[PDB]
Design a protein around this nucleic acid. Structure first.
Lengths: 80, 97, 105, 93, 95, 103, 97, 78
DNA sequence: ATCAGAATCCCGGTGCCGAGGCCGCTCAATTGGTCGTAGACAGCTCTAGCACCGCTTAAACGCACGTACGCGCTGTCCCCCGCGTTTTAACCGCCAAGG
DNA sequence: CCTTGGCGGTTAAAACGCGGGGGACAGCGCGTACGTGCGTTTAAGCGGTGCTAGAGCTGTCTACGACCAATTGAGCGGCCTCGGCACCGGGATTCTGAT
């Protein structure tokens, strides 16, 4: 519960600064939280499918990396 | 110890956080959100440290790219501030929901 | 020269690539010249990435290569950024890109 | 367990390119994942080309046209030249 | 001479079950054939990569099922898994 | 034949032959071609029924590619699936933004 | 008589919304495609369905880019599209490095 | 040459997407982007033809070049 | 609003052609067997994920705080468009070829 | 027995004059939203503890897929028919500019 708000407002501030935002609005945080939640839902579902087919109930690093690979946001350094 | 007009403090934070590379989204709240999301789907889920770190870094990269696109939309519109409509347009052009 | 790697004069192992192709489920039979060409292509791509990674490192005067250098090298070059615009490097960040109007006036 | 990696080959390539430069284990894993992804992409594209062309075997022309297709013109030309030089070096002797 | 294969008859049949009083232009029939081939090869490639990562060289019904779970959207994935499981059971039951 | 033994218009022999020729693994299970054929048949059936819906929207019985593309684009799921895929003689939905209507 | 600007374009939009025929005529696009292809080979030819598929793809890509450009202009509180709008759409699309 | 994509052709292509007012410098950017896209797609198709050892580009080659570009097109028995 | 005046929504007609009717052909999908291995079942093993608090410390919290770039409101100036207009040349027919 | 174009003939399309007025274009009220700080409120994370089934590998057998050769019937090759939807033209919907 309330984990969607777990990403604090200053954390989103730092994310924006890395992105390159100078002026940040107050409703940006909620939309960013929604985008993060949707992307996490997709990647987690893909990784869960990967680990279920393996008959392993533990989500492994290779499962998540392969899920990111299939989603078009392939991430490196973690096997797969 | 000084407060300037809006932006020079913003420029300082931008320079600091572009000079820095460590994870901006904190690991514990992000992992808590991941576990909350995964609870609704499947029970008895164990996450590896590298798996959660991969989730965190991929989400950070996607968010930063979306922020770059939003900044491009605002600046092209001769605007500095970003509005939820800016993010809506950026995601509309990007193609990931 | 006993191993085919010495005959081909490359660095990447031909044997492990051949084994992976055998356990690849993409082709029944594999030619005798394809592994060498693929190894050369992989070596050239790795060298292309590593040259710009070292360029960034020497710009930063850092011996060890951190993922920040890899991401900066991939994003800076037009060819790699166009090629790898959908590719994400862990702990990489993004380029320092300041627009003209972003600087305070 | 018996999990193979390409760390030593990357180290040797770095030594032959930069004799006095190192790299991190995280960057090593990043390079390993990049190699795996590019290998998967190349294998899939070769498979689709072979299935279209009805070829039961793979020759150098397939991977040459694959390099031409995926990489941009200059990078594709350089990679094709390097691979053809390697093939000629192996075949001549 | 070349005897190229086509899914013309099967696509015509399927449209007739879903709409008897509905003609289909050869363009639409080709579109249906292309869609069928695309989806089949998509699920086949997903099963191939699942067999790759799982260190198992056998594609049973489980591999295609997880491929469909990964490929099709949630509600569509659920419907396809249900129908495919029913089809697999009825295929295994009989001769 | 194995066409009707799986209760599908698409035969098992053709699909299993395609699987064997694709070398998607060392061996293909018995239910895999049947699974694929059933999924394909349902997908083409729903495509064609939304095509008929587009056809009756256009007041025409015979399916034209315009009907197929309207079927693709009305449904959210299919537009999500075949959004990057275009159709010859397909077109797009009736889309009018209210911002540009005259006063 | 002379109408006011704006309504006509809406009328042809509504009418052409019911048709799917290829916009660009055959011979000029044909010549453009073949002069571009002449930079790749001499005395090269395409297939008829290949040419029609190239026309369909070019039309679809250009229409998508124009929709992106119009969305960028409207979100920038503008109605007439400018090349900078196309540049923004391309940059967000990721093609331009 | 580049005038093959005529002013009315660009007008129709823009109006298909819902554009209302078009500038005089839009034609140049549109023609440049179309030239880039055509160069890429024709490059892929000609590379396919070189691989095929044939003399004429086929419809399958164009469709699969579009697919590799991520722009798959239906209607041609791909 | 108010009809004008074209302009679009659906129509009877209309005629020569896209889909789809009739019947083979014909080899590959189908048959059962007999090989034959891989993987799900069974069990094995210790590793880093686990429950949990528990303190730290960089960081999160709230709205008072400046304040500037955002948006009310408009002039500006004009870049373009509506339409006719005339020239453009692509297209309906015509079969190509070559291996 | 194929694909640009050789091009005849087209007939409506390329190319463009061009007005006018509403939009491009910047200017500027204005002021509510809100950087920046920054202490208050929050609880991060970094290093720990044993918990402890289960990832992974090995066993493992045997159910299940592959291999062989006969098979056998529908898969897609050949020509012909004829009314849905496009076209030729009227008439009536459904709009909207000037009013």
């Amino acid at each position: 519960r309330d984990n969607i708000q777990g990403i604090t407002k200053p954390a989103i501030r730092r994310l924006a600064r890395r992105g390159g935002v100078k002026r940040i609005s107050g409703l940006i945080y909620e939309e960013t939280r929604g985008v993060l939640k949707v992307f996490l839902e997709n990647v987690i579902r893909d990784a869960v499918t990967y680990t279920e087919h393996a008959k392993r109930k533990t989500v492994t690093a290779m499962d998540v990396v392969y899920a990111l690979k299939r989603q078009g946001r392939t991430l490196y350094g973690f096997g797969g | 110890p000084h407060r300037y007009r809006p932006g020079t403090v913003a420029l300082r934070e931008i320079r600091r956080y572009q000079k820095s590379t460590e994870l901006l989204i904190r690991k514990l709240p992000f992992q808590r959100l991941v576990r909350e999301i995964a609870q609704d789907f499947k029970t008895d889920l164990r996450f590896q440290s590298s798996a959660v770190m991969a989730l965190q870094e991929a989400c950070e990269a996607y968010l930063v790219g979306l922020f770059e696109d939003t900044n491009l939309c605002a600046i092209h519109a001769k605007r500095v501030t970003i509005m939820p409509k800016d993010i809506q347009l950026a995601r509309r052009i990007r193609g990931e929901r | 020269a006993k191993t085919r790697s010495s005959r081909a004069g490359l660095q990447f192992p031909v044997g492990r690539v051949h084994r992976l192709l055998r356990k690849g489920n993409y082709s029944e039979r594999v030619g005798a010249g394809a592994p060498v060409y693929l190894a050369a292509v992989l070596e050239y791509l790795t060298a292309e990435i590593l040259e710009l990674a070292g360029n960034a490192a020497r710009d930063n005067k850092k011996t060890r290569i951190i993922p920040r250098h890899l991401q900066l090298a991939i994003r800076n070059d037009e060819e790699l950024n166009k090629l790898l615009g959908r590719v994400t490097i862990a702990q990489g960040g993004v380029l320092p890109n300041i627009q003209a109007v972003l600087l305070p006036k | 367990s018996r999990k193979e990696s390409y760390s030593i080959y990357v180290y040797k390539v770095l030594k032959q390119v930069h004799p006095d430069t190192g790299i991190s284990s995280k960057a090593m894993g990043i390079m390993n994942s990049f190699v795996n992804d590019i290998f998967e992409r190349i294998a899939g594209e070769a498979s689709r080309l072979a299935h279209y062309n009805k070829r039961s075997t793979i020759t150098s022309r397939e991977i040459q046209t694959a390099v031409r297709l995926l990489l941009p013109g200059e990078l594709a030309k350089h990679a094709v030249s390097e691979g053809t030089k390697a093939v000629t070096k192996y075949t001549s002797a």
